[PDB]
Design a protein around this ligand. Structure first.
Ligand SMILES: Nc1ncnc2c1ncn2[C@@H]1O[C@H](COP(=O)(O)OP(=O)(O)O)[C@@H](O)[C@H]1O
Ligand code: BEF
Ligand SMILES: [Mg+2]
Lengths: 32, 65, 615
């Protein structure tokens, strides 16, 4: 189970951010 | 109770400042400041500022030859 | 174009319609389209004979754009001049071109290939006892070279300094000069017994580059271009190991020179006794018959003020007749003064190593008669998909300019305008959120900034180390080692000094705040820091490159102008108009108007021997 957990953590470490998943043009512009 | 004909311009701070600069050069452009995102402009100058402003913005964008 | 009726839509193509020619019956197999006017070459990468042309085209035609499916090459005089050097005649080029072309080759194209593919291989420049002799294999050349307005079996002397003049003159005249070294039969120069250790693993593209150079058997002078981090250093090691003669290496940095020696030692069997490092720190030279001196252009190109300690070494370098010179980052040699070295120093063969062979001025083409033609170039995406280099999720973040600062942008001058829109508060907030988000992801981040003032302000505000010109070598080395091996320092703040030739195998993420206007080369060099990441083969690995730029500023002019080279390679930038989850971060810099106003003013304000006792 630990190795499976480590593999899951390894996959998470490699996952790209959310903003890369979808084109964030329609959403409100970044800022404070 | 007082009405004043004009053109309501909605834009962003960056465009707002550009309109002010054009208004500084030509006084009649802006008739009154409403808010940080709304301006009152002369209807006659609308057709001229739109085309000239694009030329000014062309400097900020690099068109290769 | 005979008896070809124009089409109704032929006016859309201004003297560019190529429908007048006919298509061969074997079009389905032949992958090549040839432009009869501009020489453009469209290549099918999804049809047979694609691989057989992917290498031939690179030799005779420079690559304009090579995207996934359809590659774009172009035939030019320089491209042909590069192919003719490596044992290629007009017949070979025409035969292969026709055999692979869907459409017949026009007469104009045939004429172009014939003219430039016959010049190479009639005049040779040789060196003997530090004396330059322009040796020719036939006596007829004497009536040409000796009678030339510029110049001055038969062999005649020529001024060492005038090499840069005659070589350019040779370009104008029919016959250009070729620098071939028969190191096998050269016994006068002391030999060096060095070889690559068994642990070495020459990658397939490295072998192809060497084959294009040693195909005939005689070393040719020229330039080799490989992607950043591809191993250009190892390329010089292999050439030294096979030549087995005294060699000198010039590298454009102090840290990088330290990198070359360590790499030399690790990859080949060069004994330490035969290796000497000519740098500012130590100035002792090898006394063995054959050795290696690794220096920089500033130590070989400087002419006015050389130190007494550094003056003896310069005489040591000049006195001996070197057999090979390795010019790392050959994109700096065609400068105003660096070109002087090629004429002063004596060497029978010259090699150029650079990841980027482009520059703002037109002097790049001068490399043909300075060091020689371009032998080989390697694709970027091809190595990315094969696991040789990491994949990158290139991104471009648009940070709107704050209202307060933008007001001064209009009135302010160009010189001060740069600082105004580079330090807008919004960029500070985005950088802090990205750093925190990526740090928890276990990613080593690099933040580039050409402006030193911004670097210090960002560094001090976030309490992170920064590096630039004034920092001593000892301190930066400690910083680099700590960042490399110490988990506490996960992010750093690089500057123009670290723009190229520094290896960070642990780096995976890359950020850039400021930039040196429109230079497309600096863009590629900076990206190279993360292209050599440690885990570039694990499943789903994708490096990240963020480019924060102020909207409605001159940065868009510079951004789209300094990123036109990566697009040609194949890289695609993703536009990030909004960064998800940026507002929920607890604290952001310059969140209140009071801080913004304070920063605005702070940045705006920036612009008788006995009498000796008396005295
Ligand atoms: N054949 C190879 N085997 C192992 N590592 C290699 C090989 N070729 C290159 N490298 C590594 O690539 C990295 C970058 O090498 P370097 O010569 O600095 O590249 P460049 O000069 O092209 O930017 C170094 O870590 C080096 O050890
Ligand atoms: F292209 Be490398 F970083 F010298
Ligand atoms: Mg290098």
């Amino acid at each position: 189970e630990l190795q499976e957990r480590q593999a899951e953590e390894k996959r998470k470490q490699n996952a790209v951010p959310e903003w890369h998943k979808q084109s964030t043009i329609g959403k409100t512009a970044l800022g404070r | 109770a007082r009405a004043r004909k004009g053109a309501l311009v909605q834009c962003d701070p960056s465009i707002k400042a550009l309109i002010l600069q054009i208004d500084a050069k030509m006084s009649d452009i802006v008739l009154e400041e409403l808010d940080d995102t709304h301006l009152l402009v002369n209807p006659s100058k609308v057709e001229f500022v739109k085309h000239e402003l694009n030329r000014l913005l062309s400097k900020n964008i690099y068109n290769p030859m | 174009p005979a008896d070809f009726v124009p089409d109704s839509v032929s006016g859309m193509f201004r003297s560019h319609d190529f429908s007048y020619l006919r298509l061969r019956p074997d079009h389905a197999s032949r992958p090549l389209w040839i432009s009869p006017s501009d020489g453009r070459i469209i290549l099918e990468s999804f049809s047979p004979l694609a691989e057989q042309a992917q290498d031939f085209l690179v030799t005779i035609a420079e690559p304009i754009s090579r995207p996934s499916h359809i590659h774009e090459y172009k035939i030019t005089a320089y491209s042909l001049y590069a192919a003719v050097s490596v044992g290629l005649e007009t017949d070979d080029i025409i035969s292969v071109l026709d055999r692979l072309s869907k459409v017949p080759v026009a007469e104009s194209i045939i004429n172009f290939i014939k003219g430039a593919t016959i010049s190479y291989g009639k005049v040779k420049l040789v060196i003997k006892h530090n004396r330059y002799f322009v040796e020719t294999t036939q006596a007829d050349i004497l009536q040409m070279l000796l009678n030339d307005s510029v110049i001055g079996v038969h062999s005649f002397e020529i001024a060492n300094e005038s090499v840069e003049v005659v070589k350019k003159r040779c370009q104008e005249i029919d016959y250009p000069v070729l620098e071939e070294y028969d190191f096998r039969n050269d016994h006068r120069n002391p030999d060096l017994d060095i070889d690559l250790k068994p642990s070495t693993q020459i990658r397939p593209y490295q072998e192809k580059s060497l084959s294009k150079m040693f195909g005939n058997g005689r070393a040719r002078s020229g330039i080799i271009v490989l992607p950043c981090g591809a191993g250009k250093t190892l390329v010089g090691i292999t050439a030294a190991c096979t030549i087995k003669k005294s060699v000198i290496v010039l590298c454009t940095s102090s840290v990088s020179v330290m990198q070359w020696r360590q790499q030399f030692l690790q990859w080949c069997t060069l004994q330490p006794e035969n290796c000497a490092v000519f740098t500012s720190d130590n100035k002792e030279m090898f006394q063995t018959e054959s050795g290696l001196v690794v220096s920089t252009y500033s130590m070989v190109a400087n002419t006015r003020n050389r130190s007494h300690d550094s003056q003896k070494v310069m005489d040591f370098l000049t006195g001996r007749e070197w057999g090979f010179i390795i010019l790392d980052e050959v994109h700096v040699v065609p400068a105003a003064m660096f070109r002087r070295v090629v004429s002063t120093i004596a060497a029978h063969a010259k090699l150029g190593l650079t990841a980027t062979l482009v520059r703002e001025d037109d002097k790049i083409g001068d490399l043909n008669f300075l060091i020689g033609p371009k032998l080989y170039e390697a694709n970027w995406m091809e190595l990315s998909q094969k696991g040789h280099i990491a994949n990158v999720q290139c991104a471009e973040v648009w940070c709107p300019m704050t209202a307060e600062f933008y007001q001064e942008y209009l009135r302010e001058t160009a010189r001060k305008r740069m600082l105004l829109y580079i330090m807008n508060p919004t960029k500070f907030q985005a950088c802090q959120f990205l750093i925190q988000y990526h740090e928890r992801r276990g990613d080593k981040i690099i933040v580039f900034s050409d402006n030193v003032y911004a670097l210090q302000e960002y560094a001090l505000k976030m309490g992170k180390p920064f590096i630039y010109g004034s920092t001593p070598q000892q301190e930066r080395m400690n910083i680099l080692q700590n960042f490399q091996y110490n988990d506490q320092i996960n992010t750093i703040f690089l500057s123009k000094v670290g723009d190229t030739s520094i290896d960070l195998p642990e780096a995976t993420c890359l950020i850039q705040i400021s930039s040196h206007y429109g230079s497309r080369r600096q863009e590629a060099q900076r990206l190279g820091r993360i292209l050599r990441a440690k885990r570039r083969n694990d499943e789903g690995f994708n490096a990240f490159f963020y480019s924060l730029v102020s909207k409605d500023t001159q940065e868009m002019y510079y951004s789209t102008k300094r990123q036109a080279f990566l697009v040609d390679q194949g890289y695609a930038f993703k536009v990030i108009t909004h960064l998800h989850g940026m507002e929920n971060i607890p604290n952001l810099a310059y969140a209140s108007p009071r801080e913004r106003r304070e920063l605005l003013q702070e940045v705006l304000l920036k612009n008788h021997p006995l009498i000796r006792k008396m005295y």
